[PDB]
Design a protein around this nucleic acid. Structure first.
Lengths: 400, 554
RNA sequence: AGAUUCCGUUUUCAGUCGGGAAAAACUGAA
């Protein structure tokens, strides 16, 4: 077919990312995966004269049988022209948020048909590493819409639309949202009657959000109120005001007035009895200021809660939590924090794809070095969100 | 024997045009020599005469070789390179000898003259022109242009590697048994074969190269078990590296200074730290390549420290791809650790030291982990899998620590080994306030302008200290204050700050620190019997707080 | 009132500190 012309964003050159060291194993894996694609002619060997490079790696999928090539296109994507003329995944459903069950499909393999604009192929250059560097790397260049590219789906937007239209008009009420290589097929039909529709949708292509829930902040249930037990409460409710401007500690601080030993017990008087109960109300009443602005990034923050539990909040502007939650991956033996944090990361971005239709940008509570040496071992996704390493302060306590 | 391989298309950096530089007239002698020389490269096909039209030019140099009427002439390509299409060097690094598996039959063919054999793209040759004035005085000048990868040119290596591989590919699809590793002009050819049949394969291979102009000299490897592939003497069970000699001549010439860098830098992927970085500064102000230019104590001393390291040789075993990898780390001191990756008790691959302290306040538990992760990838690079560890830390000590830590962490093939210096969390804070402990309300402050402040406290009993302070920040006072209350108190103490900074540092259970006060604050912490550090919202009328608040104000 | 965070290398390595809230340092050695 005649290739759709795509071009890098104004005044940005293609990507030039160094490759991370790969295990004598993932390498071998890749090496065969490529030699085939080469035979199928989806890729093609290139030289040292193509100054560009994106890193690749071997993910390994679903119930884990084999191997998958994963190109970390994040850069080429940042440098790729936005898609808005050929409206990339047109309006976001908004229905998805609400359906009894969404299911994601890997429409991705479709991409390998449509030919990629020749004057753009250089920008997908990737290099398979060699052990001990005993060999020049094998370098290639895509010749078709590549798997993780931003350009891909939008370009193939129409082909897809024609493909689903029948089945969509055939079942006027099953929402289908395409995001990257996935197809989020949501419905409210019974589980069995859902699956059929998927299968019907599946032949075509062959040619549970409604349970999600937010975190209601609550103060403890006490009687044994020591001085610091109150000091605690006071501190939190202080910070909590930044979120709910109505909450106020004062009658509480009054209980504390003195120079009392932390262990001293204290009589919770009506002053506070009024305030706690009154505050408890507002901690469950919606911060009317929440707004998902399509033009702002989503930020996700995760805190470690020790019991193989973690807490996260997605927000565009601070204190305006679009959503908050808590993943508790009880890994009695599978306790690789790294593995957990990872699973956290993966489960949070899928939630956001299904809701806001964007993968948040994460602020990981871990050292780059560490996150950098094991992440791949557990990553199971076709995609990879952006991430920034950080050091969590007392939020662990501030909401757990 | 100029190879018939297709040429890699080279460009100049966009916005730039080839070089144009004047050649300082050389001595009658020098000139007569460069000609003498250039004339045969012209004969061999390596270069060629060209008309005085070609705008571009690069300088030539090279003195008496000390053996009859010849000279050693090496060209200044600095400019041409400064305007050349930077290529993509396709390798994570140099190969480590320990990474090599043990083979039965191995030979190392040094492909000779390999550069001059591999042809340069036509449309870039223009740029490689150079002249030969030398004619004493009524000088005009000879004018040549390369036809093959030039010696100093930026492309050379990257283009040569690409060529070398395209050529080996064929012979390789044919001999899957054979293993060819290239690294510059050296072809390590190994194969687990009968010295007879190997000999034959090496014959075959040697001829393939020849059909591509790559001539492999007879002065090869034919006997000696200590093959020198990349300076690694490759004995059948022990690769080694002969200590690198590093001279210090009279005429310390610029290029010499550059090449010197090379040797150092090459060894560096074995030999721990050598970077003559401050000598490198001498290269940050380049001039004629033939000029001599020394440097101060920076220069002089750098070479020495490098030498010390370069003196003691190194070596290890090869990589049995059937025996486990075992890394063993040991806390050989403050902020410096050691480790060894072996497969057979006294037959280790790489040993290593790991000095680091990633934080202003770290923990041994924390640093151990860092050391682990370093070693993990480091293997994944060299061997291709993550080793199994033997670490100076008890399984329960880890388990408590991760649970008591806000960040997520993880070590792989963890296994306890009771070694002498062990790792432990020196202390821990109380989860809940100590009953009957004098509660210290702490706070400090300092005027930004003056950089002076006070630090003190008040208590549930009656004690009430306060202290004058010079040149500090409010963080430093808030810490001073925690310190005081620590000193002026007993084995069990509840303490309380209006500062998340100090709280944080302490919460992290810092073993040591760059911060003396923090160290001070730590020394006490290890001495006390129970500590519970709490935090309260500054400026709220929180009891005791409002009080110490006023005491530190002026 | 004070206090966070991210970035500057982006194939790696050799040599040190500061700004801003999507925004900003090189050479040499591999």
């Amino acid at each position: 077919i005649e290739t759709v012309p795509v071009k890098l964003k104004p005044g940005m050159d293609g990507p030039k990312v160094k490759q991370w060291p790969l295990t004598e194993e993932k390498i071998k894996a890749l090496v065969e995966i490529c030699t085939e694609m080469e035979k199928e002619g989806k890729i093609s060997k290139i030289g040292p004269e193509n100054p560009y490079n994106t890193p690749v790696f071997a993910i390994k999928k679903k119930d884990s049988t084999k191997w998958r090539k994963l190109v970390d296109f994040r850069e080429l994507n940042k440098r790729t022209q936005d898609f808005w003329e050929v409206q990339l995944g047109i309006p976001h459903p908004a229905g998805l948020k609400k359906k009894k069950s969404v299911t994601v499909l890997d429409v991705g393999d479709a991409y390998f048909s449509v030919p990629l604009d020749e004057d753009f192929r250089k920008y997908t250059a990737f290099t398979i590493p060699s052990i001990n560097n005993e060999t020049p790397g094998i370098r290639y260049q895509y010749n078709v819409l590549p798997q993780g590219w931003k350009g891909s789906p939008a370009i193939f937007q129409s082909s897809m639309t024609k493909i689903l239209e029948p089945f969509k008009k055939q079942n006027p009420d099953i929402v289908i949202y395409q995001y990257m290589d996935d197809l989020y097929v949501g419905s409210d039909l019974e589980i069995g009657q859902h699956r059929t529709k998927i299968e019907e949708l599946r032949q075509h292509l062959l040619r549970h959000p409604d349970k999600w829930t937010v975190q209601p902040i609550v103060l403890p249930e006490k009687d044994s109120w020591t001085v610091n037990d109150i000091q605690k409460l006071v501190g939190k409710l202080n910070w909590a005001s930044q979120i709910y401007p109505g909450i106020k500690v004062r009658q509480l601080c009054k209980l504390l007035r003195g120079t009392k030993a932390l262990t001293e017990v204290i009589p919770l008087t009506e002053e506070a009895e009024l305030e706690l109960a009154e505050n408890r109300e507002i901690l469950k009443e919606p911060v009317h200021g929440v707004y998902y602005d399509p033009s702002k990034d989503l930020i996700a923050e995760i805190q470690k809660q020790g019991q193989g539990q973690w807490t996260y909040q997605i927000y565009q502007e601070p204190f305006k939590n679009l959503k908050t939650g808590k993943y508790a991956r009880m890994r009695g033996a599978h306790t690789n924090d790294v593995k957990q944090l990872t699973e956290a990361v993966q489960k949070i971005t899928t939630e956001s794809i299904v809701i806001w239709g964007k993968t948040p940008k994460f602020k990981l509570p871990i050292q780059k070095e560490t996150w950098e040496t094991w992440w791949t071992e557990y990553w199971q996704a076709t995609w990879i969100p952006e991430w920034e390493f950080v050091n969590t302060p007392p939020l662990v306590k501030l909401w757990y | 024997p100029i190879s018939p391989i297709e040429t890699v298309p080279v460009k100049l950096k966009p916005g730039m045009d080839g070089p144009k530089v004047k050649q300082w007239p050389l001595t009658e002698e020098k000139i007569k020599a460069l000609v003498e020389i250039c004339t045969e490269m012209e004969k061999e096909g390596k270069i060629s005469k060209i008309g005085p039209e070609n705008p571009y030019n690069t300088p030539v140099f090279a003195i008496k070789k000390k053996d009859s009427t010849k000279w050693r002439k090496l060209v200044d390509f600095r400019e041409l390179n400064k305007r050349t299409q930077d290529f993509w060097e396709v390798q994570l690094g140099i190969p480590h000898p320990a990474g090599l598996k043990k083979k039965k039959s191995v030979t190392v063919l040094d492909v000779g003259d390999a550069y001059f054999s591999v042809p340069l793209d036509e449309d870039f040759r223009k740029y490689t022109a150079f002249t030969i004035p030398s004619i004493n005085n009524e000088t005009p000048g000879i004018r040549y242009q390369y036809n093959v990868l030039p010696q100093g040119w930026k492309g050379s290596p990257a283009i040569f590697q690409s060529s070398m591989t395209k050529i080996l590919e064929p012979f390789k699809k044919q001999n899957p048994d054979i293993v060819i590793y290239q690294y510059m002009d050296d072809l390590y050819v190994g194969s687990d074969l009968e010295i007879g049949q190997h000999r034959t394969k090496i014959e075959e291979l040697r001829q393939h190269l020849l059909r591509w102009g790559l001539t492999t000299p007879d002065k090869k490897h034919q006997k000696e078990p200590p093959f020198l592939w990349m300076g690694y003497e490759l004995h059948p069970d022990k690769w080694t590296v002969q200590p690198i000699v590093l001279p210090e001549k009279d005429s310390w010439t610029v290029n010499d200074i550059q090449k010197l860098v090379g040797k150092l830098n090459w060894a560096s992927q074995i030999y721990p730290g050598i970077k003559v970085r401050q000598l490198c500064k001498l290269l940050r102000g380049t001039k004629a390549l033939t000029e001599v230019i020394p440097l101060t104590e920076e220069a002089e001393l750098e070479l020495a420290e490098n030498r010390e390291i370069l003196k003691e040789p190194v070596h290890g075993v090869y990589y049995d791809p059937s025996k486990d990898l075992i890394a063993e780390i040991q806390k050989q001191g403050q902020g410096q650790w050691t480790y060894q990756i072996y497969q057979e008790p006294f037959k280790n691959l790489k040993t290593g030291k790991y000095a680091r302290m990633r934080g202003a306040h770290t923990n041994d538990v924390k640093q151990l982990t860092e050391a682990v992760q370093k070693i993990t990838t480091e293997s994944i690079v060299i061997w291709g899998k993550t080793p199994k560890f033997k670490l100076p830390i008890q399984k329960e000590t880890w388990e408590t620590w991760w649970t008591e830590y806000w960040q997520a962490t993880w070590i792989p093939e963890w296994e306890f080994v009771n070694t002498p210096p062990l790792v432990k969390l020196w202390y821990q804070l109380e989860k809940e306030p100590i009953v009957g402990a004098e509660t210290f309300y702490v706070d400090g402050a300092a005027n930004r302008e003056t950089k002076l402040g006070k630090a003190g406290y008040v208590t549930n009993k009656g004690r009430q200290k306060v202290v004058p302070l010079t040149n500090t920040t409010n963080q430093k006072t808030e810490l001073q204050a925690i310190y005081l209350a620590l000193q002026d108190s007993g084995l069990e103490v509840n303490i309380v700050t209006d500062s998340q900074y100090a709280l944080g540092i302490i919460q992290a259970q810092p073993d040591k620190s760059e911060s003396e006060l923090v160290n001070q604050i730590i020394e006490q912490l290890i001495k006390k019997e129970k500590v519970y550090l709490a935090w309260v919202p500054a400026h709220k009328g929180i009891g005791g707080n409002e009080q110490v608040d006023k005491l530190v104000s002026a």
